[PDB]
Amino acid sequence: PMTLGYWNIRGLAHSIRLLLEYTDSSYEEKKYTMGDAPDYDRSQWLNEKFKLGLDFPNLPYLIDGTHKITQSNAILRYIARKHNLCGESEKEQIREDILENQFMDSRMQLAKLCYDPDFEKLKPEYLQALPEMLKLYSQFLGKQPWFLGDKITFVDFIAYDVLERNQVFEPSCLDAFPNLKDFISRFEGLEKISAYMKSSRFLPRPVFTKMAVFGNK
Amino acid sequence: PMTLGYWNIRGLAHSIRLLLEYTDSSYEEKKYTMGDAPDYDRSQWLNEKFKLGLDFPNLPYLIDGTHKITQSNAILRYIARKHNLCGESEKEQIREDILENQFMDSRMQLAKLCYDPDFEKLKPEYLQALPEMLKLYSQFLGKQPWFLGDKITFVDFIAYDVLERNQVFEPSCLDAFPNLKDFISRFEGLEKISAYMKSSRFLPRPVFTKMAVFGNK
């Protein structure tokens, strides 16, 4: 078995869990929690942070025998690699890295709103810019069933997440982009995935359980 | 002839320059520039932005014949892959993913405060939290000449710019870490790297944007 670990919330560990299901990987989730006090105490992780014995302690993490991986991307590539879910040619590879990185910056932009207290006043900013960075993805993807081509790679697990996050934030965001919304319906079509969305284990409390009224409240 | 492209000021494209020079790649730097504070006008690029045919207009970028690339890491990996500067074994594979993504984090940490309005107030914090980061690296190298092992790869280049940038903020920061020092010495003393260092083609303005009152010159 393997061991993944993150906060009781969504966070980065999401796609990571999704990629772990598509590969039938037998993993376990050491879930850490933030103290429900007005001020959320994050010292639960801290207590173990250094005892796990990780090269660069941080959450999320994945331990596997003689392999304790850290850094969201570093964890995904590891799994994907063991299941041929990575690009094979320079071509599919340049697309792969561009996306891999891009989606991250994009993951940040949305996350910023939540990290910043003055969300409500700054929320519009992200909303107005959305379409531009959206059409870019829908154009790059184009007529492809999966972002890279006719084969599914780890990069889709990243994609889907960054696209669902914007979908729950604002549902109309994808209506003008048929292929993008269609992309999501295809992802949420994989047996191994659909089945997972019908599992006994999913959020006990709402999304963003801790931090940001964008879920916390 | 490949095509690079970034603001006149050093920025983050320092690693690509070094790698390109270490790999003897013929390249033409299409240097851009902005206006002065407060009007930080960056028109030249702004207009040119989309006509370049970049599927994801962003800076920096590299136009390699057909392969037009964006995203720092992507550009680095491309070149690094062209001349075999990468990890082969799963140990080297997993190793480079960790560091590559980690250094990016640290690189995001430093700049975030130089671009920050209260730099003169955040400064002592990063100082106090520098040794943690800096030790983590020294522990992840030990007696190895290169982070990956016995091969210089793009990681060592990316690790150089960061360790270099941090050795500016506080020149003594890495003094308590002897191997980190020998590393910097090691990189700087490479047949081709040295030649580039002491050239007439090494003159972009210092550490990041002029907005930041951090080593502007």
Side-chain angles (χ1 to χ4, degrees):
Chain A
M2 320 190 316
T3 297
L4 198 78
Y6 197 62
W7 303 104
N8 164 263
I9 65 171
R10 170 90 72 112
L12 308 158
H14 201 35
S15 60
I16 312 183
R17 291 177 164 139
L18 291 173
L19 168 73
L20 250 50
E21 282 300 295
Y22 178 63
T23 63
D24 260 292
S25 301
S26 55
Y27 68 109
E28 292 210 283
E29 305 159 1
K30 188 178 279 183
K31 311 178 62 188
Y32 300 111
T33 319
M34 292 180 81
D36 46 51
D39 56 301
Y40 282 77
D41 190 42
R42 64 185 71 199
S43 302
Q44 189 182 128
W45 149 234
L46 281 46
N47 218 129
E48 279 207 280
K49 192 175 174 70
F50 295 92
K51 262 54 70 67
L52 272 306
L54 301 185
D55 298 282
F56 291 87
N58 173 231
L59 282 187
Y61 70 93
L62 170 76
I63 304 181
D64 176 66
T66 318
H67 290 115
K68 306 83 190 184
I69 344 294
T70 336
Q71 292 287 298
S72 178
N73 303 71
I75 305 172
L76 251 92
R77 283 193 179 267
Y78 177 66
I79 306 308
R81 198 189 291 112
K82 296 156 68 66
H83 310 304
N84 206 101
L85 287 172
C86 300
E88 307 125 293
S89 56
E90 281 250 19
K91 296 244 182 176
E92 308 170 314
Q93 291 175 284
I94 291 179
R95 313 194 89 233
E96 177 169 58
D97 304 324
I98 295 177
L99 300 179
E100 171 191 60
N101 274 85
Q102 185 59 78
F103 281 107
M104 183 52 89
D105 311 342
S106 311
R107 220 169 185 167
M108 304 302 276
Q109 312 296 290
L110 194 293
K112 180 180 179 181
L113 289 171
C114 306
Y115 274 33
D116 183 64
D118 210 35
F119 166 75
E120 60 155 296
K121 311 271 70 177
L122 279 304
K123 180 173 55 56
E125 205 69 62
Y126 191 94
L127 217 300
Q128 65 176 127
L130 273 168
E132 185 195 28
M133 64 91 103
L134 261 305
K135 63 172 58 65
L136 293 170
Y137 285 128
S138 49
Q139 191 188 293
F140 176 88
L141 171 57
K143 199 188 299 167
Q144 303 172 308
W146 305 104
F147 264 92
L148 262 57
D150 286 66
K151 179 189 168 195
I152 178 177
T153 49
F154 76 89
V155 201
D156 291 276
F157 288 82
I158 302 175
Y160 166 62
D161 194 40
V162 187
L163 292 161
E164 172 184 39
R165 284 254 68 225
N166 278 287
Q167 195 186 81
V168 311
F169 169 41
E170 172 57 85
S172 316
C173 68
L174 297 163
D175 287 6
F177 307 103
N179 60 306
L180 281 191
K181 61 179 191 183
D182 291 325
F183 163 87
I184 301 171
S185 37
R186 168 166 42 242
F187 187 101
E188 291 196 353
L190 275 57
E191 176 204 335
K192 303 180 165 178
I193 302 303
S194 321
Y196 178 75
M197 307 191 132
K198 294 175 175 297
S199 292
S200 51
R201 256 61 73 127
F202 255 48
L203 263 171
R205 297 286 172 175
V207 163
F208 224 139
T209 29
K210 275 69 213 69
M211 187 69 120
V213 185
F214 183 18
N216 199 138
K217 287 82 57 186
Chain B
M2 295 188 207
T3 323
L4 188 66
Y6 209 16
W7 300 120
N8 182 272
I9 295 72
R10 178 192 187 184
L12 58 72
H14 189 48
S15 317
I16 305 168
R17 290 171 165 242
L18 296 159
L19 186 45
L20 282 167
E21 286 296 2
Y22 180 79
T23 55
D24 297 333
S25 301
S26 183
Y27 68 102
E28 289 171 282
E29 306 147 299
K30 184 182 288 185
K31 296 186 69 178
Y32 297 98
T33 310
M34 304 185 295
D36 282 66
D39 257 39
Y40 284 104
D41 328 278
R42 63 215 81 194
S43 301
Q44 43 186 242
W45 163 246
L46 212 71
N47 300 109
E48 184 182 331
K49 195 171 184 174
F50 297 90
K51 280 170 276 185
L52 285 156
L54 288 173
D55 35 56
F56 280 115
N58 175 265
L59 277 174
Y61 67 86
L62 187 78
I63 314 298
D64 196 294
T66 352
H67 310 113
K68 314 186 192 305
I69 314 181
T70 56
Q71 295 295 307
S72 312
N73 290 37
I75 303 181
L76 289 157
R77 280 194 127 144
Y78 174 41
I79 307 167
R81 195 189 305 98
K82 288 300 301 165
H83 309 274
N84 225 92
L85 286 327
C86 285
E88 291 178 30
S89 52
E90 165 70 79
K91 261 65 175 61
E92 298 181 48
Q93 280 279 285
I94 189 275
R95 243 185 177 282
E96 65 177 31
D97 303 330
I98 302 293
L99 294 165
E100 161 205 54
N101 254 72
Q102 191 81 21
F103 281 111
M104 171 58 47
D105 276 353
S106 312
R107 185 186 249 133
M108 286 299 101
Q109 184 187 10
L110 229 177
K112 180 180 180 180
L113 58 87
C114 292
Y115 290 62
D116 202 282
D118 306 304
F119 158 69
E120 298 279 83
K121 314 198 67 169
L122 271 43
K123 185 190 178 67
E125 278 285 60
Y126 188 57
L127 283 174
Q128 189 168 44
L130 250 176
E132 304 182 295
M133 177 177 101
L134 288 156
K135 183 181 182 176
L136 295 169
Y137 292 126
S138 62
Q139 284 182 127
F140 207 59
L141 192 54
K143 42 271 292 67
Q144 300 167 213
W146 305 113
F147 287 89
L148 275 286
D150 53 0
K151 285 175 56 184
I152 175 169
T153 64
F154 73 123
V155 165
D156 304 285
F157 293 71
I158 200 167
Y160 168 79
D161 181 57
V162 178
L163 291 182
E164 218 267 78
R165 286 195 62 224
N166 268 301
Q167 188 176 242
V168 175
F169 179 66
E170 171 57 89
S172 67
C173 70
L174 44 60
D175 286 14
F177 308 108
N179 60 344
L180 286 184
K181 294 210 300 189
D182 297 337
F183 176 85
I184 288 188
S185 310
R186 219 184 324 279
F187 192 83
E188 294 190 326
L190 286 170
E191 303 274 310
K192 240 80 191 181
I193 302 293
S194 312
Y196 172 43
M197 294 299 263
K198 306 171 178 174
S199 79
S200 322
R201 309 307 167 247
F202 201 0
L203 68 162
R205 219 189 183 177
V207 50
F208 282 113
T209 50
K210 53 184 306 306
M211 289 73 107
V213 67
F214 187 80
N216 308 60
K217 71 287 293 296

